[PDB]
């Protein structure tokens, strides 16, 4: 009686009503923003929920303007947003003449998830 | 009797109502927003579910401008976005002459998922 | 007697209700936004699901203008968007001259998902 | 000019979805039972009117009778009823001799409903 | 001018979702049970209205009765009734035999709802 | 100019969403149980409205009886009822001899609901 086993057994993450990322290599850039769990049981109420709540019965606004001369206005902008460059800028002239405001630029990447290496040597006679 | 068993065994993930991923290799951008789990159970009543609420009965408004000049107005602009680059400008002259700006440019990626190297050697007689 | 068992045996993923992605190589630009799992179950009563919940009797509303000169108006603009280069300009002269403003130019990429590199020796008489 | 104006003006009630009597003369044995008025508006969930609820899983059961003698079971008799004179009874003798348990007998009524006894007199010359 | 006016204005009741009786002579006998007036408004959830609310999974049961003699039962009876006069009983002999037991006999009425006895002279000349 | 105005303007009761009686002469026998006003407005919750609630798991149950003799079992009986006379006995022998046990017997009514004994004398010249 002989027996050499080799098993690899290899299983999946289990989610259950959520979220969920596994084993990760060479992540550059990541972003994941209001990714939220809620389990609400309600009986005779009433439930509000709320990540980002806002109210506001006046909110950026403007006045009258008579007869003014070279204003700027930039309400409320850039708002829960990502990865701006050089935008919703306000002038009169806006020159671009140098080699820079490089974003993210000639990675070199060499990643491996999962390595196993292995020697099975066995039953000699 | 001489057994040599080899099995590699492999089974994905498990979701059971939500967001999932797995073993990622070279992942350079990434961008995942407002995935949310919710489980609602309501007997006799008001359930207000919200990840972004917002309620502006004046938002991001104008006045009345008699007779001006050269006003610049960018309201609530850029919002809830991503990747924008030299976007939503307010000028009169707008230049752009060098060789810059750039975004992920000439990245090199040398990446492996699972990797088995096995040897198996055995019943030898 | 002699048995020799070789069984790459491999199975995906189990998803029930939900969103879900795999193993996954060489993954340069990825988005994913509003991939949300709800489960709601109501008796007797009222339920408001809601992710991105706007309520604005006034929104991005411009005055009323008598007889101004070269007003620029840009509101709510690059709105919940992605992947927006040099738009939405407001001028008089917009003038491109540079060799920039590149995006995602020459990658070099070598992925491999899965590999199985295995040797299987065996029963020997 | 000579006016000599008469007019018995009479109108009967009023009734908006409701259970109504007049005037009533001479009533001598009334009954008037469950008259119920209900207004029901209902949104997003359940009503239940009840004026009379019973819920009885075992309700005037008799139990098993093996071998007796001479048992009297009368279970959830004259139930919401009128007028019973002598009724549902249970012996193994019933003797009526007497000159009795009259009900209602031998009345004298004289009753008016409406009595109007006018002199109108007038105009002499 | 002469005016000699006489008006017997005369009006019902008003009923508005109600249970309305007027003015009443010669009532000997007066039953109303239950008459309930409800007005339900229900929004997001469970109404219940009772009333007579009786909830009994065991109600008037009688065991089990091996081998016994001259047992005598009345369970639940002369329920939610009215003018029950020597009924439901429970013997052997039952005998009647006086002049008795008598209900309502021989009543004498005179009566008037409305007596208007009126004179009207006038206007002499 | 000479005017004799006379007018018994008579108007009848005036019900909104209620139990309603006038003014009543001769009222004998009155029974008036259970006549309720309710007004319920539910908005996200249980409204329960009761007047009578009983809530019994066992109620007026009779045990189990083997060989026993001459038991009496009235459980439960002459329950909300009325107008009960020589009712829902348990004997062997019942006799009823007298002249007695009369219930409203020979009743001698003169009644009126409204007397108006007017005299109107005018205008003599």
């Known amino acids: 009686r002989c027996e050499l086993a080799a098993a690899m057994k290899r299983h999946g993450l289990d989610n259950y009503r959520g979220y969920s990322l596994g084993n990760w290599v060479c992540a550059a850039k990541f972003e994941s923003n209001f990714n939220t769990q809620?389990?609400?049981?309600?009986?005779?109420?009433?439930?509000?929920?709320?990540?980002?709540?806002?109210?506001?019965?006046?909110?950026?606004?403007?006045?009258?303007?008579?007869?003014?001369?070279?204003?700027?206005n930039i309400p409320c902008s850039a708002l829960l947003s990502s990865d701006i460059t050089?935008?919703?800028?306000?002038?009169?002239?806006?020159?671009?003449?140098?080699?820079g405001m490089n974003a993210w630029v000639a990675?070199?990447?060499?990643?491996?998830?999962?390595?196993?290496?292995?020697?099975?040597?066995g039953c000699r006679l």
């Open 38 to 72: 809620a389990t609400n049981r309600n009986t005779d109420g009433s439930t509000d929920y709320g990540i980002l709540q806002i109210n506001s019965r006046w909110w950026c606004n403007d006045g009258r303007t008579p007869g003014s001369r070279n204003l700027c």
């Open 86 to 99: 050089a935008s919703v800028n306000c002038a009169k002239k806006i020159v671009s003449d140098g080699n």
């Open 107 to 121: 990675w070199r990447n060499r990643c491996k998830g999962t390595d196993v290496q292995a020697w099975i040597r």
